[PDB]
PDB file of C-alpha atoms and ligand atoms in Angstrom:
ATOM      1  CA  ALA A   1     -40.855 -22.961 -94.152  1.00 31.04           C
ATOM      2  CA  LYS A   2     -39.496 -26.323 -94.721  1.00 30.47           C
ATOM      3  CA  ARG A   3     -41.093 -29.009 -96.916  1.00 31.21           C
ATOM      4  CA  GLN A   4     -43.607 -30.962 -94.724  1.00 29.17           C
ATOM      5  CA  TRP A   5     -43.673 -34.760 -96.142  1.00 29.53           C
ATOM      6  CA  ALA A   6     -47.000 -36.515 -96.010  1.00 33.13           C
ATOM      7  CA  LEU A   7     -47.759 -39.932 -96.786  1.00 34.59           C
ATOM      8  CA  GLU A   8     -50.556 -38.101 -99.438  1.00 35.94           C
ATOM      9  CA  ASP A   9     -47.415 -36.819-100.986  1.00 37.41           C
ATOM     10  CA  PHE A  10     -46.486 -40.854-102.650  1.00 37.04           C
ATOM     11  CA  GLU A  11     -47.608 -43.372-104.751  1.00 36.75           C
ATOM     12  CA  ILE A  12     -46.618 -46.751-103.284  1.00 38.22           C
ATOM     13  CA  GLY A  13     -45.449 -49.568-105.664  1.00 34.98           C
ATOM     14  CA  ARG A  14     -43.756 -53.198-104.934  1.00 33.90           C
ATOM     15  CA  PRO A  15     -42.194 -54.166-101.762  1.00 32.41           C
ATOM     16  CA  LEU A  16     -38.042 -54.009-102.246  1.00 35.35           C
ATOM     17  CA  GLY A  17     -37.648 -55.836 -98.853  1.00 36.19           C
ATOM     18  CA  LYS A  18     -38.891 -56.534 -95.419  1.00 36.77           C
ATOM     19  CA  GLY A  19     -36.744 -55.049 -92.932  1.00 36.31           C
ATOM     20  CA  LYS A  20     -37.025 -56.049 -88.868  1.00 37.48           C
ATOM     21  CA  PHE A  21     -39.445 -53.267 -87.905  1.00 35.31           C
ATOM     22  CA  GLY A  22     -41.993 -52.783 -91.268  1.00 33.08           C
ATOM     23  CA  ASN A  23     -41.031 -52.715 -95.207  1.00 35.62           C
ATOM     24  CA  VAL A  24     -39.187 -50.683 -98.214  1.00 36.35           C
ATOM     25  CA  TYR A  25     -41.385 -50.063-100.860  1.00 34.16           C
ATOM     26  CA  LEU A  26     -40.488 -48.708-104.757  1.00 34.20           C
ATOM     27  CA  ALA A  27     -42.300 -44.946-104.495  1.00 35.96           C
ATOM     28  CA  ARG A  28     -43.408 -42.276-106.248  1.00 36.05           C
ATOM     29  CA  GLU A  29     -43.429 -38.394-105.536  1.00 36.19           C
ATOM     30  CA  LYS A  30     -46.737 -37.768-107.507  1.00 37.93           C
ATOM     31  CA  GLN A  31     -46.192 -34.325-108.800  1.00 39.16           C
ATOM     32  CA  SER A  32     -42.804 -35.311-109.917  1.00 35.36           C
ATOM     33  CA  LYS A  33     -42.943 -38.933-110.688  1.00 36.76           C
ATOM     34  CA  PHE A  34     -39.304 -39.166-109.103  1.00 35.20           C
ATOM     35  CA  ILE A  35     -38.757 -43.010-107.894  1.00 37.94           C
ATOM     36  CA  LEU A  36     -37.248 -43.052-104.241  1.00 39.70           C
ATOM     37  CA  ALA A  37     -37.192 -45.778-101.809  1.00 38.00           C
ATOM     38  CA  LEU A  38     -40.116 -44.835 -98.982  1.00 33.65           C
ATOM     39  CA  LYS A  39     -38.946 -47.210 -96.125  1.00 33.32           C
ATOM     40  CA  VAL A  40     -42.135 -47.310 -93.368  1.00 35.24           C
ATOM     41  CA  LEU A  41     -41.223 -48.578 -89.500  1.00 36.07           C
ATOM     42  CA  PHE A  42     -43.783 -49.029 -87.295  1.00 35.51           C
ATOM     43  CA  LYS A  43     -43.682 -47.105 -83.689  1.00 33.98           C
ATOM     44  CA  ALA A  44     -44.800 -50.290 -81.955  1.00 36.50           C
ATOM     45  CA  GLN A  45     -42.272 -52.437 -83.090  1.00 34.38           C
ATOM     46  CA  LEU A  46     -39.588 -49.753 -82.759  1.00 33.97           C
ATOM     47  CA  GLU A  47     -40.504 -49.047 -78.951  1.00 37.97           C
ATOM     48  CA  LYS A  48     -40.420 -53.230 -78.320  1.00 38.55           C
ATOM     49  CA  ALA A  49     -36.727 -53.515 -79.680  1.00 38.82           C
ATOM     50  CA  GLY A  50     -35.445 -50.453 -78.026  1.00 40.40           C
ATOM     51  CA  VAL A  51     -34.296 -48.802 -81.429  1.00 44.10           C
ATOM     52  CA  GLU A  52     -35.663 -45.179 -81.497  1.00 42.56           C
ATOM     53  CA  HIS A  53     -32.864 -43.961 -80.392  1.00 40.07           C
ATOM     54  CA  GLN A  54     -30.513 -45.641 -82.599  1.00 39.99           C
ATOM     55  CA  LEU A  55     -33.145 -43.735 -85.620  1.00 35.18           C
ATOM     56  CA  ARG A  56     -32.873 -40.306 -84.589  1.00 31.67           C
ATOM     57  CA  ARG A  57     -29.464 -40.509 -84.169  1.00 32.13           C
ATOM     58  CA  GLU A  58     -29.125 -41.865 -87.655  1.00 32.03           C
ATOM     59  CA  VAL A  59     -31.926 -39.340 -88.688  1.00 35.19           C
ATOM     60  CA  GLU A  60     -29.848 -36.581 -87.296  1.00 32.97           C
ATOM     61  CA  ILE A  61     -26.323 -37.490 -88.831  1.00 31.31           C
ATOM     62  CA  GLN A  62     -28.229 -38.426 -92.388  1.00 33.25           C
ATOM     63  CA  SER A  63     -29.804 -35.760 -92.800  1.00 35.38           C
ATOM     64  CA  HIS A  64     -26.641 -33.817 -92.945  1.00 38.69           C
ATOM     65  CA  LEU A  65     -24.725 -35.675 -95.055  1.00 37.87           C
ATOM     66  CA  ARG A  66     -24.260 -35.584 -99.025  1.00 39.86           C
ATOM     67  CA  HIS A  67     -22.119 -37.649-101.183  1.00 42.81           C
ATOM     68  CA  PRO A  68     -22.999 -39.575-103.981  1.00 41.05           C
ATOM     69  CA  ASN A  69     -21.562 -42.901-102.245  1.00 40.07           C
ATOM     70  CA  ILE A  70     -23.786 -42.920 -99.186  1.00 42.23           C
ATOM     71  CA  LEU A  71     -27.349 -42.868 -99.730  1.00 43.08           C
ATOM     72  CA  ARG A  72     -29.496 -39.859 -99.227  1.00 42.33           C
ATOM     73  CA  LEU A  73     -31.648 -39.271 -96.779  1.00 46.04           C
ATOM     74  CA  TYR A  74     -33.914 -36.938 -98.621  1.00 47.23           C
ATOM     75  CA  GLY A  75     -36.172 -36.452 -95.806  1.00 49.12           C
ATOM     76  CA  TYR A  76     -38.662 -38.340 -92.888  1.00 47.32           C
ATOM     77  CA  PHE A  77     -42.166 -37.700 -91.569  1.00 48.56           C
ATOM     78  CA  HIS A  78     -44.300 -39.548 -89.012  1.00 47.52           C
ATOM     79  CA  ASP A  79     -47.962 -39.726 -88.201  1.00 46.77           C
ATOM     80  CA  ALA A  80     -49.151 -41.741 -84.407  1.00 49.11           C
ATOM     81  CA  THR A  81     -47.964 -45.203 -85.671  1.00 47.25           C
ATOM     82  CA  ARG A  82     -45.300 -45.337 -88.125  1.00 50.54           C
ATOM     83  CA  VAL A  83     -41.898 -43.512 -88.871  1.00 50.80           C
ATOM     84  CA  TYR A  84     -41.129 -42.892 -92.918  1.00 50.08           C
ATOM     85  CA  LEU A  85     -38.153 -42.549 -94.529  1.00 52.37           C
ATOM     86  CA  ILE A  86     -37.271 -41.121 -97.739  1.00 57.05           C
ATOM     87  CA  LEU A  87     -34.533 -42.183 -98.926  1.00 57.21           C
ATOM     88  CA  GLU A  88     -32.257 -42.736-102.640  1.00 57.45           C
ATOM     89  CA  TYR A  89     -33.090 -46.111-104.412  1.00 54.90           C
ATOM     90  CA  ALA A  90     -30.123 -47.926-105.305  1.00 57.67           C
ATOM     91  CA  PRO A  91     -31.358 -50.032-108.488  1.00 59.27           C
ATOM     92  CA  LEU A  92     -28.869 -52.759-108.411  1.00 57.72           C
ATOM     93  CA  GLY A  93     -29.459 -54.194-105.171  1.00 56.47           C
ATOM     94  CA  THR A  94     -27.058 -54.648-102.548  1.00 55.28           C
ATOM     95  CA  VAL A  95     -22.947 -55.590-102.616  1.00 55.83           C
ATOM     96  CA  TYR A  96     -23.834 -58.599-100.622  1.00 57.01           C
ATOM     97  CA  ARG A  97     -26.680 -59.940-103.136  1.00 59.26           C
ATOM     98  CA  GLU A  98     -23.992 -59.592-105.805  1.00 62.07           C
ATOM     99  CA  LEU A  99     -21.033 -61.169-104.180  1.00 64.41           C
ATOM    100  CA  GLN A 100     -23.544 -64.210-103.213  1.00 66.54           C
ATOM    101  CA  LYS A 101     -24.135 -64.259-107.234  1.00 67.01           C
ATOM    102  CA  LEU A 102     -20.430 -64.238-107.997  1.00 67.24           C
ATOM    103  CA  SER A 103     -19.255 -65.631-104.964  1.00 70.22           C
ATOM    104  CA  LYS A 104     -15.999 -62.937-105.290  1.00 69.87           C
ATOM    105  CA  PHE A 105     -15.241 -59.766-107.635  1.00 67.89           C
ATOM    106  CA  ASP A 106     -12.580 -59.124-109.506  1.00 66.68           C
ATOM    107  CA  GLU A 107      -9.749 -56.397-109.008  1.00 68.94           C
ATOM    108  CA  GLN A 108     -11.107 -54.023-110.714  1.00 66.39           C
ATOM    109  CA  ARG A 109     -14.368 -54.128-109.200  1.00 64.14           C
ATOM    110  CA  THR A 110     -12.855 -54.726-106.007  1.00 66.85           C
ATOM    111  CA  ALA A 111     -10.553 -51.715-106.354  1.00 69.09           C
ATOM    112  CA  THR A 112     -13.331 -49.219-107.518  1.00 72.40           C
ATOM    113  CA  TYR A 113     -15.492 -49.951-104.717  1.00 71.85           C
ATOM    114  CA  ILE A 114     -12.723 -49.416-102.059  1.00 78.11           C
ATOM    115  CA  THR A 115     -11.853 -45.883-104.049  1.00 77.73           C
ATOM    116  CA  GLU A 116     -15.535 -45.176-103.579  1.00 76.19           C
ATOM    117  CA  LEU A 117     -15.966 -46.431-100.101  1.00 78.55           C
ATOM    118  CA  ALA A 118     -12.640 -44.407 -98.865  1.00 78.00           C
ATOM    119  CA  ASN A 119     -13.846 -41.216-100.549  1.00 77.90           C
ATOM    120  CA  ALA A 120     -17.042 -41.203 -98.779  1.00 79.15           C
ATOM    121  CA  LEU A 121     -15.486 -42.280 -95.504  1.00 76.11           C
ATOM    122  CA  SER A 122     -13.171 -39.555 -96.012  1.00 76.03           C
ATOM    123  CA  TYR A 123     -15.666 -36.901 -96.257  1.00 78.81           C
ATOM    124  CA  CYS A 124     -17.731 -38.556 -93.206  1.00 79.76           C
ATOM    125  CA  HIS A 125     -14.581 -37.868 -91.316  1.00 79.34           C
ATOM    126  CA  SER A 126     -14.343 -34.572 -92.219  1.00 78.27           C
ATOM    127  CA  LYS A 127     -17.837 -34.248 -90.715  1.00 77.98           C
ATOM    128  CA  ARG A 128     -16.791 -35.851 -87.667  1.00 76.77           C
ATOM    129  CA  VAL A 129     -18.889 -39.159 -88.811  1.00 77.28           C
ATOM    130  CA  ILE A 130     -17.175 -41.941 -87.917  1.00 74.15           C
ATOM    131  CA  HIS A 131     -17.187 -45.860 -87.041  1.00 73.14           C
ATOM    132  CA  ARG A 132     -19.528 -46.416 -90.548  1.00 76.56           C
ATOM    133  CA  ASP A 133     -21.115 -49.527 -90.976  1.00 77.43           C
ATOM    134  CA  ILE A 134     -20.084 -50.759 -94.466  1.00 73.75           C
ATOM    135  CA  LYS A 135     -20.221 -54.234 -94.480  1.00 72.85           C
ATOM    136  CA  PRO A 136     -21.754 -55.780 -98.118  1.00 70.96           C
ATOM    137  CA  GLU A 137     -25.314 -56.284 -96.792  1.00 70.17           C
ATOM    138  CA  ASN A 138     -25.001 -52.532 -96.068  1.00 70.96           C
ATOM    139  CA  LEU A 139     -23.943 -51.299 -99.527  1.00 68.40           C
ATOM    140  CA  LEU A 140     -26.311 -50.468-102.274  1.00 67.77           C
ATOM    141  CA  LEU A 141     -25.452 -50.221-106.054  1.00 66.27           C
ATOM    142  CA  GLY A 142     -26.609 -47.065-108.042  1.00 66.67           C
ATOM    143  CA  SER A 143     -27.562 -47.243-111.890  1.00 66.98           C
ATOM    144  CA  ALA A 144     -23.969 -46.476-112.904  1.00 66.46           C
ATOM    145  CA  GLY A 145     -22.936 -49.236-110.676  1.00 65.11           C
ATOM    146  CA  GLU A 146     -21.302 -46.848-108.143  1.00 67.85           C
ATOM    147  CA  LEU A 147     -21.351 -47.781-104.609  1.00 66.50           C
ATOM    148  CA  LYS A 148     -23.294 -46.668-101.842  1.00 63.68           C
ATOM    149  CA  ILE A 149     -23.375 -46.804 -98.018  1.00 61.44           C
ATOM    150  CA  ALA A 150     -26.598 -47.353 -96.983  1.00 61.45           C
ATOM    151  CA  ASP A 151     -28.027 -45.989 -93.652  1.00 61.65           C
ATOM    152  CA  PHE A 152     -29.980 -47.769 -90.799  1.00 61.12           C
ATOM    153  CA  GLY A 153     -28.231 -51.384 -91.373  1.00 61.06           C
ATOM    154  CA  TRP A 154     -29.897 -52.001 -87.785  1.00 59.48           C
ATOM    155  CA  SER A 155     -33.087 -51.913 -89.683  1.00 61.18           C
ATOM    156  CA  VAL A 156     -32.442 -54.661 -91.587  1.00 61.03           C
ATOM    157  CA  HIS A 157     -32.189 -58.502 -91.218  1.00 58.64           C
ATOM    158  CA  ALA A 158     -28.894 -59.681 -90.698  1.00 58.57           C
ATOM    159  CA  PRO A 159     -27.979 -62.523 -93.775  1.00 61.75           C
ATOM    160  CA  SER A 160     -29.027 -65.618 -93.639  1.00 61.30           C
ATOM    161  CA  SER A 161     -27.304 -67.015 -90.870  1.00 60.16           C
ATOM    162  CA  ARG A 162     -23.807 -66.152 -91.869  1.00 61.08           C
ATOM    163  CA  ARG A 163     -23.227 -63.027 -89.534  1.00 61.34           C
ATOM    164  CA  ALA A 164     -22.868 -63.849 -85.841  1.00 59.75           C
ATOM    165  CA  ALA A 165     -22.861 -60.055 -83.219  1.00 59.71           C
ATOM    166  CA  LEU A 166     -21.331 -58.952 -80.013  1.00 59.11           C
ATOM    167  CA  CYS A 167     -21.199 -55.229 -79.617  1.00 57.00           C
ATOM    168  CA  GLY A 168     -21.374 -55.139 -83.911  1.00 57.25           C
ATOM    169  CA  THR A 169     -20.897 -57.976 -85.860  1.00 58.85           C
ATOM    170  CA  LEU A 170     -17.801 -60.296 -84.756  1.00 57.72           C
ATOM    171  CA  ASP A 171     -16.543 -60.863 -88.470  1.00 57.32           C
ATOM    172  CA  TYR A 172     -15.894 -57.168 -88.334  1.00 61.75           C
ATOM    173  CA  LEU A 173     -14.664 -55.831 -85.117  1.00 62.54           C
ATOM    174  CA  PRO A 174     -11.535 -54.372 -84.794  1.00 62.76           C
ATOM    175  CA  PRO A 175      -9.032 -55.601 -81.885  1.00 63.30           C
ATOM    176  CA  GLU A 176      -8.881 -52.447 -80.001  1.00 61.64           C
ATOM    177  CA  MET A 177     -12.949 -53.044 -79.844  1.00 61.19           C
ATOM    178  CA  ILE A 178     -12.569 -56.285 -78.599  1.00 61.46           C
ATOM    179  CA  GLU A 179      -9.545 -55.818 -75.926  1.00 60.19           C
ATOM    180  CA  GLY A 180     -11.774 -53.343 -74.735  1.00 57.42           C
ATOM    181  CA  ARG A 181      -9.498 -49.936 -75.884  1.00 62.37           C
ATOM    182  CA  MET A 182     -10.148 -47.237 -76.966  1.00 62.34           C
ATOM    183  CA  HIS A 183     -11.580 -46.561 -80.568  1.00 64.69           C
ATOM    184  CA  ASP A 184     -11.259 -43.776 -83.315  1.00 58.50           C
ATOM    185  CA  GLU A 185     -11.859 -42.901 -86.834  1.00 57.48           C
ATOM    186  CA  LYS A 186      -9.201 -45.596 -87.300  1.00 61.52           C
ATOM    187  CA  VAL A 187     -11.899 -48.440 -86.963  1.00 63.31           C
ATOM    188  CA  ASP A 188     -13.056 -47.556 -90.164  1.00 61.80           C
ATOM    189  CA  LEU A 189      -9.478 -48.631 -92.059  1.00 64.03           C
ATOM    190  CA  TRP A 190     -10.032 -51.899 -90.391  1.00 64.40           C
ATOM    191  CA  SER A 191     -13.504 -52.220 -92.054  1.00 66.91           C
ATOM    192  CA  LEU A 192     -11.725 -51.641 -95.069  1.00 66.33           C
ATOM    193  CA  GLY A 193      -9.358 -54.115 -94.864  1.00 65.48           C
ATOM    194  CA  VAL A 194     -11.940 -56.689 -94.091  1.00 65.58           C
ATOM    195  CA  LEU A 195     -14.656 -55.476 -96.294  1.00 66.74           C
ATOM    196  CA  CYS A 196     -11.655 -55.790 -99.251  1.00 66.10           C
ATOM    197  CA  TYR A 197     -10.412 -58.998 -98.352  1.00 66.03           C
ATOM    198  CA  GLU A 198     -14.135 -60.076 -98.350  1.00 64.26           C
ATOM    199  CA  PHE A 199     -14.908 -58.558-101.887  1.00 61.92           C
ATOM    200  CA  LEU A 200     -11.255 -60.363-103.554  1.00 57.66           C
ATOM    201  CA  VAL A 201     -11.820 -63.846-101.218  1.00 57.14           C
ATOM    202  CA  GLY A 202     -16.015 -64.303-101.382  1.00 55.39           C
ATOM    203  CA  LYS A 203     -15.281 -64.679 -96.894  1.00 53.84           C
ATOM    204  CA  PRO A 204     -13.861 -62.421 -94.323  1.00 51.47           C
ATOM    205  CA  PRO A 205     -10.550 -62.796 -92.832  1.00 49.18           C
ATOM    206  CA  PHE A 206     -11.584 -64.801 -89.190  1.00 46.49           C
ATOM    207  CA  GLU A 207     -14.582 -66.456 -90.564  1.00 44.77           C
ATOM    208  CA  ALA A 208     -13.766 -69.831 -88.253  1.00 47.48           C
ATOM    209  CA  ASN A 209     -16.182 -72.137 -86.992  1.00 48.44           C
ATOM    210  CA  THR A 210     -16.820 -71.376 -83.885  1.00 47.43           C
ATOM    211  CA  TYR A 211     -17.546 -67.930 -82.029  1.00 44.37           C
ATOM    212  CA  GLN A 212     -14.225 -68.058 -79.273  1.00 43.80           C
ATOM    213  CA  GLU A 213     -11.667 -68.638 -82.404  1.00 42.45           C
ATOM    214  CA  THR A 214     -13.037 -65.650 -84.427  1.00 43.95           C
ATOM    215  CA  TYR A 215     -12.415 -63.992 -81.551  1.00 47.37           C
ATOM    216  CA  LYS A 216      -9.284 -64.920 -81.473  1.00 46.53           C
ATOM    217  CA  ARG A 217      -8.116 -64.821 -85.013  1.00 45.28           C
ATOM    218  CA  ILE A 218      -8.797 -61.494 -84.782  1.00 42.93           C
ATOM    219  CA  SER A 219      -7.247 -60.325 -81.965  1.00 42.89           C
ATOM    220  CA  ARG A 220      -3.774 -62.026 -82.901  1.00 43.16           C
ATOM    221  CA  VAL A 221      -4.967 -60.943 -86.493  1.00 46.00           C
ATOM    222  CA  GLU A 222      -4.990 -64.608 -87.876  1.00 46.68           C
ATOM    223  CA  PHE A 223      -5.550 -64.112 -91.275  1.00 46.30           C
ATOM    224  CA  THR A 224      -3.451 -66.079 -95.090  1.00 45.52           C
ATOM    225  CA  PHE A 225      -4.866 -65.149 -98.343  1.00 43.27           C
ATOM    226  CA  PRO A 226      -5.668 -67.818-101.549  1.00 43.91           C
ATOM    227  CA  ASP A 227      -3.554 -68.186-103.599  1.00 42.61           C
ATOM    228  CA  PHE A 228      -5.204 -66.253-106.337  1.00 40.88           C
ATOM    229  CA  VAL A 229      -5.354 -62.969-104.049  1.00 39.91           C
ATOM    230  CA  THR A 230      -1.788 -60.519-105.948  1.00 36.90           C
ATOM    231  CA  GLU A 231       0.895 -58.988-103.936  1.00 37.86           C
ATOM    232  CA  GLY A 232      -0.746 -55.705-104.670  1.00 37.03           C
ATOM    233  CA  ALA A 233      -3.965 -56.489-103.070  1.00 38.84           C
ATOM    234  CA  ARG A 234      -2.371 -58.583-100.368  1.00 37.92           C
ATOM    235  CA  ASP A 235      -0.397 -55.584 -99.375  1.00 37.00           C
ATOM    236  CA  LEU A 236      -3.033 -52.742 -99.129  1.00 36.11           C
ATOM    237  CA  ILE A 237      -5.067 -55.328 -97.162  1.00 35.79           C
ATOM    238  CA  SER A 238      -2.081 -55.877 -94.864  1.00 34.45           C
ATOM    239  CA  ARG A 239      -1.734 -52.182 -94.465  1.00 35.42           C
ATOM    240  CA  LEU A 240      -4.960 -51.987 -93.874  1.00 34.55           C
ATOM    241  CA  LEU A 241      -5.181 -54.861 -90.980  1.00 35.84           C
ATOM    242  CA  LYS A 242      -2.476 -53.476 -88.538  1.00 38.57           C
ATOM    243  CA  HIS A 243      -3.440 -54.006 -84.720  1.00 41.55           C
ATOM    244  CA  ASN A 244      -2.087 -50.872 -83.883  1.00 40.83           C
ATOM    245  CA  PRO A 245      -4.979 -48.524 -84.994  1.00 39.35           C
ATOM    246  CA  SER A 246      -2.076 -45.696 -85.579  1.00 43.08           C
ATOM    247  CA  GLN A 247      -0.003 -47.838 -87.945  1.00 43.35           C
ATOM    248  CA  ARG A 248      -2.807 -48.324 -90.456  1.00 42.54           C
ATOM    249  CA  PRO A 249      -2.762 -45.585 -93.332  1.00 43.39           C
ATOM    250  CA  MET A 250      -4.787 -42.638 -93.689  1.00 45.53           C
ATOM    251  CA  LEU A 251      -7.646 -43.103 -96.461  1.00 43.27           C
ATOM    252  CA  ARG A 252      -5.867 -41.030 -99.142  1.00 42.54           C
ATOM    253  CA  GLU A 253      -2.931 -43.675 -98.431  1.00 41.94           C
ATOM    254  CA  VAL A 254      -6.115 -46.012 -99.470  1.00 40.30           C
ATOM    255  CA  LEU A 255      -6.776 -43.809-102.741  1.00 40.44           C
ATOM    256  CA  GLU A 256      -3.141 -43.128-104.051  1.00 40.50           C
ATOM    257  CA  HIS A 257      -1.980 -47.447-102.686  1.00 38.99           C
ATOM    258  CA  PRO A 258      -0.339 -48.433-106.162  1.00 37.38           C
ATOM    259  CA  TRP A 259      -2.887 -51.861-106.551  1.00 35.84           C
ATOM    260  CA  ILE A 260      -6.137 -49.256-106.049  1.00 33.64           C
ATOM    261  CA  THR A 261      -5.046 -46.657-108.497  1.00 34.53           C
ATOM    262  CA  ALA A 262      -3.895 -49.843-111.335  1.00 40.06           C
ATOM    263  CA  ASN A 263      -7.217 -51.285-110.964  1.00 41.42           C
ATOM    264  CA  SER A 264      -9.719 -48.256-110.045  1.00 39.73           C
ATOM    265  CA  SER A 265      -9.527 -46.316-113.349  1.00 44.61           C
ATOM    266  CA  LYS A 266     -12.742 -44.561-113.331  1.00 44.51           C
ATOM    267  CA  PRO A 267     -12.660 -40.808-113.252  1.00 43.76           C
ATOM    268  CA  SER A 268     -13.687 -39.762-109.656  1.00 41.51           C
TER     269      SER A 268
HETATM  270  C1  LIG B   1     -35.870 -56.228-110.532  1.00 37.60           C
HETATM  271  N1  LIG B   1     -35.427 -56.817-109.032  1.00 37.60           N
HETATM  272  C2  LIG B   1     -34.326 -56.806-108.983  1.00 37.60           C
HETATM  273  C3  LIG B   1     -33.738 -57.661-107.517  1.00 37.60           C
HETATM  274  N2  LIG B   1     -34.005 -56.712-106.382  1.00 37.60           N
HETATM  275  C4  LIG B   1     -33.347 -56.551-105.946  1.00 37.60           C
HETATM  276  O1  LIG B   1     -32.559 -57.241-104.830  1.00 37.60           O
HETATM  277  C5  LIG B   1     -33.341 -55.120-105.058  1.00 37.60           C
HETATM  278  C6  LIG B   1     -33.397 -54.499-103.832  1.00 37.60           C
HETATM  279  C7  LIG B   1     -33.764 -53.605-103.547  1.00 37.60           C
HETATM  280  C8  LIG B   1     -33.141 -52.216-104.292  1.00 37.60           C
HETATM  281  N3  LIG B   1     -32.937 -50.885-103.663  1.00 37.60           N
HETATM  282  C9  LIG B   1     -32.822 -50.249-102.505  1.00 37.60           C
HETATM  283  N4  LIG B   1     -32.827 -48.510-102.947  1.00 37.60           N
HETATM  284  C10 LIG B   1     -32.946 -48.581-101.483  1.00 37.60           C
HETATM  285  C11 LIG B   1     -32.870 -49.212-100.233  1.00 37.60           C
HETATM  286  C12 LIG B   1     -33.222 -50.346-100.300  1.00 37.60           C
HETATM  287  N5  LIG B   1     -33.281 -50.718-101.831  1.00 37.60           N
HETATM  288  C13 LIG B   1     -34.079 -51.341 -99.156  1.00 37.60           C
HETATM  289  C14 LIG B   1     -35.238 -52.265 -99.420  1.00 37.60           C
HETATM  290  C15 LIG B   1     -34.982 -52.996 -98.541  1.00 37.60           C
HETATM  291  C16 LIG B   1     -34.803 -53.299 -97.743  1.00 37.60           C
HETATM  292 CL1  LIG B   1     -35.278 -54.070 -95.979  1.00 37.60          CL
HETATM  293  C17 LIG B   1     -33.638 -52.036 -96.666  1.00 37.60           C
HETATM  294  C18 LIG B   1     -33.327 -51.119 -98.067  1.00 37.60           C
HETATM  295  C19 LIG B   1     -31.820 -49.590 -97.424  1.00 37.60           C
HETATM  296  C20 LIG B   1     -30.922 -50.469 -96.574  1.00 37.60           C
HETATM  297  C21 LIG B   1     -30.930 -50.324 -95.332  1.00 37.60           C
HETATM  298  F1  LIG B   1     -31.916 -48.881 -95.061  1.00 37.60           F
HETATM  299  C22 LIG B   1     -30.153 -50.679 -94.628  1.00 37.60           C
HETATM  300  C23 LIG B   1     -29.115 -51.477 -94.654  1.00 37.60           C
HETATM  301  C24 LIG B   1     -29.604 -52.158 -96.056  1.00 37.60           C
HETATM  302  C25 LIG B   1     -30.283 -51.797 -97.254  1.00 37.60           C
HETATM  303  F2  LIG B   1     -30.541 -51.924 -98.123  1.00 37.60           F
HETATM  304  N6  LIG B   1     -32.489 -49.101 -98.494  1.00 37.60           N
HETATM  305  C26 LIG B   1     -33.377 -48.589 -99.122  1.00 37.60           C
HETATM  306  C27 LIG B   1     -33.113 -52.528-105.665  1.00 37.60           C
HETATM  307  C28 LIG B   1     -32.996 -53.732-106.162  1.00 37.60           C
HETATM  308  C29 LIG B   1     -35.349 -56.335-106.293  1.00 37.60           C
HETATM  309  C30 LIG B   1     -35.517 -55.887-107.741  1.00 37.60           C
END
């Protein structure tokens, strides 16, 4: 006799954004006045796009994860024409918007994000959840500025025009996935390397003018740092962006890396 959710349970307020397949609203649960983000998906659009499967998979995985740096799915329900996801509201919005605003983050902000991300991924891997999307546009910020990995990235339009895709997003694809090799939890360490670089620099490390060059840069691991990137950061990013997934660090080594601990001092 779990909770049967119904639309009637919520007061809906201002739109927070348009998705590919519907909209997200600021909402309150009526009795409690608790604030949350209500995501509405239109079944006819889900069907047209062939994405129901993505939605059942994530809802299943997501309903079972509880971690302060993973955006919580509190529940879901549907009617004849709509699916509703009752999601944690992150008041500070996306990390991507904040990176656009600032162009790049400092070392403390970056290293603190990486700690949060490493903790969340390490929790995911302990539940056999692998290959999480941690692109900036899929990271939200709580009221204390804590990072939250968002659910259901495929339901939101990719940035502006900047990101190109293939079997996923080109800029974040690891070499093992583009040389058709087997892939495992070690993809998440590659992602973390790309993200750390993007945080510090303001663009991802293999960004190129064509789509085939971006691909060659990844497979060859051709990246360089702007002069302002400090040696501890270069060291971490270089350890994360190893061509061979096996030589990528464990998440615990990321968490105890001296650059991370010098710059991420917030008690976990
Ligand atoms: C006062 N202003 C300040 C500026 N604002 C924001 O930028 C902003 C945007 C969103 C939020 N918070 C928030 N929290 C949770 C979620 C969303 N958005 C939200 C809003 C719109 C859309 Cl389209 C998606 C999502 C996603 C979400 C997702 F499901 C996948 C990937 C990325 C996401 F943000 N998850 C749920 C807060 C501020 C608007 C309000």
